[PDB]
Design a protein around this ligand. Structure first.
Ligand code: NDP
Ligand code: CL
Length: 315
């Protein structure tokens, strides 16, 4: 059938300003890391994107190597965009990235100007776009001068292939250097995409304070620790360790006292200090997107609740 976005999509969703910029992101964003490749059904991928936009999720996050196979999430997103979302493309924030392994050899990974420009050209072709809203350097490249990588980002914005740029997985010291280089170049860093959840709190050691200084936004990836902070395990160590399973059980009892699912409490917790712009979820079914949006109704934490959480995590 012909897709018609829900007319009340902007009524419930909360939009949050992304650092000091003109961009407001939905409090909940959707990532295409899993369930958008050739190994899942396009019927399901389409249903996820339509349910997300109907609930006011305007930001879809991709990367060149998302699938599997690499590049298939960008192709499938490109097809669904052409078929169902073209009249509303200017209502969407689409992102992509380059920095991890995409193709074989010395120019298909890392941070060279060659890789970033060739990869974004590939990404725009797979997605059928003139530009992405945000282009990221996917991870640090310690062996390439940071200035070359940042100058490639500045070039792609000046020559209209990206509206804004970002960095992902950069530690606080490297994030400072990257932000200052981009500011001097005249293309200020819009955003940082770090891993952040109850089980991964490294950004609280300086990065969030630095981004707030510098007026740079942030979007937490793996906010459910890849699905550990859910109902899923309520087992191989890769799935969950014994100590983490005991923490999940105790965190779920606290979520129950609050009248919400563990997943909802875990997402709410990431935004508790109003110093993270958005939470980037993964989803295999539309009910998981509905669950995430349902977190907005119950995302306040008291001093006592934060102490309760820290005590569970200390065990
Ligand atoms: N910059 C970077 O280096 C990286 C970026 N990313 C980005 O961040 C996004 C988030 O990563 P991801 O770790 O997937 O996201 P989450 O941590 O939100 O976990 C998502 C997965 O957990 C399960 N899940 C989600 N909600 C629920 C729920 N309510 N009940 C039960 N299970 C649930 C689903 O798995 P199932 O199949 O079991 O239902 C889903 O695929 C990615 O989509 C991607 O765009 C991710 C990794 C690397
Ligand atoms: Cl476009």
């Amino acid at each position: 059938m012909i897709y018609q976005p829900d007319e009340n999509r902007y009524h419930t969703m909360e939009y949050r300003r992304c650092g000091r910029s003109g961009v407001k992101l939905p409090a909940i964003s959707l990532g295409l890391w899993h369930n958008f490749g050739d190994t899942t059904r396009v019927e399901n991928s389409r249903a996820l994107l339509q349910r997300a936009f109907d609930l006011g999720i305007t930001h879809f996050d991709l990367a060149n190597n998302y699938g599997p196979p690499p590049g298939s999430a960008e192709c499938n997103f490109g097809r669904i965009l052409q078929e169902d979302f073209l009249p509303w493309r200017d209502e969407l924030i689409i992102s992509t990235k380059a920095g991890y392994t995409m193709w074989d050899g010395p120019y298909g990974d890392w941070g060279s100007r060659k890789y970033l420009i060739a990869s974004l050209d590939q990404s725009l072709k797979r997605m059928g776009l003139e530009y992405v809203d945000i282009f990221y350097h996917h991870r640090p490249d310690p062996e390439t001068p940071l200035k070359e990588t940042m100058k490639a980002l500045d070039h792609l914005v000046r020559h209209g292939k990206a509206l804004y740029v970002g960095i992902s997985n950069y530690p606080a010291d490297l994030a400072r250097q990257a932000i200052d280089i981009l500011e001097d170049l005249g293309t200020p860093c819009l955003i940082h995409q770090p891993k952040y959840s109850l089980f991964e709190r490294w950004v609280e050691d300086g990065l969030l304070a630095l981004l707030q200084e510098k007026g740079v936004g942030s979007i937490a990836f793996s906010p459910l620790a890849g699905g550990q902070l859910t109902d899923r395990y309520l087992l191989k160590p890769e799935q969950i360790t014994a100590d983490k399973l005991e923490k999940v059980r105790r965190l779920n009892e606290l979520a129950a006292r609050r009248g919400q699912k563990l997943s909802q409490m875990a997402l709410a917790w990431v935004l508790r200090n109003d110093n993270v712009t958005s939470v980037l979820i993964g989803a295999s079914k539309p009910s998981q997107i509905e669950d995430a949006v349902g977190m907005l109704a119950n995302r306040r934490f008291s001093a006592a609740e934060c102490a309760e959480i820290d005590a569970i995590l200390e065990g």
